[PDB]
């Protein structure tokens, strides 16, 4: 559910702010059924944190499976950071090729016209229709890769609900395999000859793969301190507000 937000916000800013489409449909499909699955399947192999044969039976009328405390995390805090990281890699790709963030607002109507072969950028260059479309597609590829990068820290902060990572431990071999495969698939979809004709994903330059790293580290640090106040302060605000 965390991956949702960074999948809808691009279109919302598209219709309201009038900017070129940040996340394509064949890329959402690649994340929705590619990257997410193996890790989500691996999250089942997680061992207990505390003694499970010691707690009382769950109340059916109060402790549900999906409460508002979860929605506040996935839809509210983690997904938001992931969406911001994606919009960062996007603006970087368009600024390095010629379209600065001030000239993108108000361009969609002429960016999508199939009969305007002269679109001026922030520096004065004239771009044909197919040329600007290639850049938009490369922005979709990097957006998808940014999603995978932030999903790394999301799969690690989702591994444990309360306990710390330095306590439980990364003894789950399936999760490790999930991260490795999740990265190999993105690189494969972006560098195999014939993807720009079949799936529309262009190769990325090596400096762009590092635009999502800080957001991931931040997600990890935020969730770590979150899981810390719950332990030291039982029954406090962080527990009745963020404890799934």
């Amino acid at each position: 559910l965390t991956s949702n937000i960074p999948e809808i916000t691009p279109f919302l800013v598209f219709i309201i702010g009038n900017v070129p489409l940040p996340l394509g449909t064949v890329t959402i499909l690649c994340i929705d059924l590619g990257t997410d699955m193996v890790p989500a399947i691996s999250l089942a192999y997680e061992q207990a944190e505390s003694d499970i044969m010691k707690r009382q039976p769950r109340n059916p009328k109060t402790d549900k499976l999906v409460n508002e405390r979860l929605i506040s995390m996935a839809y509210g805090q983690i997904g938001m950071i992931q969406a911001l990281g994606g919009f960062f890699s996007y603006f970087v790709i368009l600024a390095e090729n010629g379209f600065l963030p001030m000239d993108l607002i108000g361009k969609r109507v002429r960016w999508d016209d199939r009969w305007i072969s002269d679109v001026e950028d922030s520096f004065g260059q004239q771009w044909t229709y197919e040329q600007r479309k290639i850049v938009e597609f490369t922005c979709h590829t990097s957006f998808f890769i940014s999603i995978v990068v932030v999903q790394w820290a999301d799969l690690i902060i989702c591994k444990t609900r309360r306990n710390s990572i330095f306590q439980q431990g990364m003894k789950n071999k399936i999760l490790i395999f999930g991260l490795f495969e999740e990265t190999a698939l993105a690189a494969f979809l972006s560098y195999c000859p014939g993807t720009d004709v079949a799936l529309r994903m262009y190769p990325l330059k090596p400096s762009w793969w590092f635009c999502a790293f800080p957001y991931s580290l931040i997600i990890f640090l935020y969730d770590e301190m979150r899981r810390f106040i719950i332990r030291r302060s039982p029954g406090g605000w962080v527990e009745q507000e963020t404890y799934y």
Partner: protein, 49 residues
């Protein structure tokens, strides 16, 4: 029984809606995007599988 179950309903409509949009988009213009014929065959596969 298993095909019309769990949340296969959410996805059945998603699939139906996807092919409806491809129908309308196809008979209206000869050059429509196909984000729907794919989105629909995929969604449907996630239910059949």
């Amino acid at each position: 029984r298993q095909l019309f179950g769990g949340f296969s309903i959410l996805l059945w409509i998603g699939a139906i809606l996807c092919f409806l949009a491809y129908g309308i988009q196809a008979a209206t213009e000869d050059e429509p995007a196909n984000d729907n014929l794919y989105l629909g065959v995929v969604l449907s596969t996630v239910v059949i599988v």
